[model samples]
Target: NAQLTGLCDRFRGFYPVVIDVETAGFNAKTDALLEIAAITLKMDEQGWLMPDTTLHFHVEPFVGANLQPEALAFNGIDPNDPDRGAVSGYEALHEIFKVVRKGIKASGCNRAIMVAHNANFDHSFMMAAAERASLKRNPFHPFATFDTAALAGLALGQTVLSKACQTAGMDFDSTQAHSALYDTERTAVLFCEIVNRWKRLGGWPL
Candidate 1:
């Protein structure tokens, strides 16, 4: 896989993709994927990230796949009829990775840093899916990751996506909490707002 250069330069022409993954449970190996959403936001000429296009997909699960009972209950992912209910871990990952590939080609960027609220969870699925697809991956390598939660804490004190949105006086969209892409969008908006606010505070743009 390719390594990321500068945070902004590696992704100069590429759009920054915000991602979220909802799982069957903590273990990605045994558990299934409930949903995975990736959001691609364009950077305006003024150099601020702006939300524009969003990519959403749901994958059908393989039959008789083992799902931890507790994980299923918490995430509400129905395995029996997963496509309509939720996306399989394998399928969802492929789709999102493909989206990134396309974005790189389309935008002419050498790389893109995957953005997320809790980046680890999403990165896990992303790596798994990439492995399944035989795609190259070095998740923490080059254009690695940008975490809004950490940024929020630095700029605004304790920060979670929801709380950050509230702190910044941004309207919260009351979507189902566990859905990946939906939550990714919320995280993206909150993150951009935070960076804007932080810059005004004479601090670094998170």
Candidate 2:
């Protein structure tokens, strides 16, 4: 138990903000962002990283952007449906950025690094959306991102999110696979699981 609790004590400076985005497709330049979610990891007195509060938004498609039919079907997103409770892309980015800024401030860390399942994919979409909205201050590092996929590959020989979750003995609910909030929550848990496993096995310095 002490070995496990010693994790945060060894790396007191690390504070990761986990994020996930659902887009209309993989092409960040032309596709539309459909949803965004983020959570700031918190360290308990025992030094284990724990999932904390979260923020989420359903973003409306960018004006005149075409959605790939396969992507839409993959996520089951209907931007046109009034019940989807979507907001304009500009509004969504502004608010998500605000939340990330506050998270960085509240975490008392020099910077909050972005953590995602397939980080490059999510990071690219986020950057494109911010640029499209002309957001002046992106609270995250421009080039730095943490990918749980890498972590999973190292620890469990799995790269796909759902398979990684399953290999880690974490619940992988197929129904919630592509929803931003659900995926973000799972990513946070998977990140912690990898770190904890590493620490326990004497693989990590702490």
Candidate 3:
């Protein structure tokens, strides 16, 4: 248990936030972003990372957004379902950014660094959504992320999220696989596992 004090120190002013965005298509620019979730991080008494508060949103597709049948089938989102109470993209991001900015300020961090499985996919959708929503205070770094697929590839020789979680001895509830909130929660755990394992092996900055 060598020292690594604070989360701010662990990543040099970048707060790690795991995110998942379920969309209506693969193209971020034109796709309907249906659902999103974010998992904030916290450091324990031993300076180990863990998931903190969770924020989630059911989003109304922007006017003129494309909804691909395959994407809906895969993610199981019904954008027009009255029971879902989906909000406008701008409103969803506005609430999310408010909390994220608070987390950044409390952690003494400069920005939120996204951590996601296939990080680019989620990040692209988020960036595009911000653009579409005309988000004035986006919380995430524009280009950088801690990609779990990439991290798992290097640490456990696995890139798929389910496989990586299984290899890490964490539960991978297949039934809950595609929900944005569940995926983000699992991704956050996987990320913490990878980082903690590295620290246990005396990786760096100890």
Highest TM-score model number: 3
Cα lDDT of candidate 2 equals 0.80
Write one digit per residue (lDDT tens) for candidate 3, span 1-206. Answer: 11222775688888888999999999999989999898888888886888888999999999999999999999888887899989988887788888888877775578888999999999999899899878878878999999999999999999999999999999999999999988998999999999999988889555
Order of all candidates by lDDT, from best down to worst? 3, 2, 1
> Comparing 1 and 2 by lDDT, which wins?
2
**Tens digit of per-residue lDDT, candidate 2, span 1-206:** 23322322444533477899998889998999999988866656655667877888999898867699899899988888988898877788687677666655543344557899889999999899888888888777888888999989999999999999999999999998999989999999999888877767888663
- For candidate 3, the per-residue lDDT at 109 reads 79
Q: What are the per-residue Cα lDDT tens digits for candidate 1 across 129-183?
A: 5555565643223435777878778766756777776777877765566666658
The true-versus-predicted C-alpha distance at residue 63 of model 2, in Å, is 1.3
Better of 1 and 3 by lDDT: 3
What lDDT is obtained when candidate 1 is compared to the true structure?
A: 0.62
- CA lDDT of each prediction against the hidden true structure: 0.62, 0.80, 0.88
Which residue segments of model 2 deviate by more than 4 Å?
Answer: 1-14
Pairs of residues clashing in candidate 3: none
Candidate closest to the true structure, highest lDDT? 3
Which wins on TM-score, candidate 1 or candidate 2?
A: 2
lDDT measured at residue 89 in model 2 versus the true structure, 0 to 100: 71
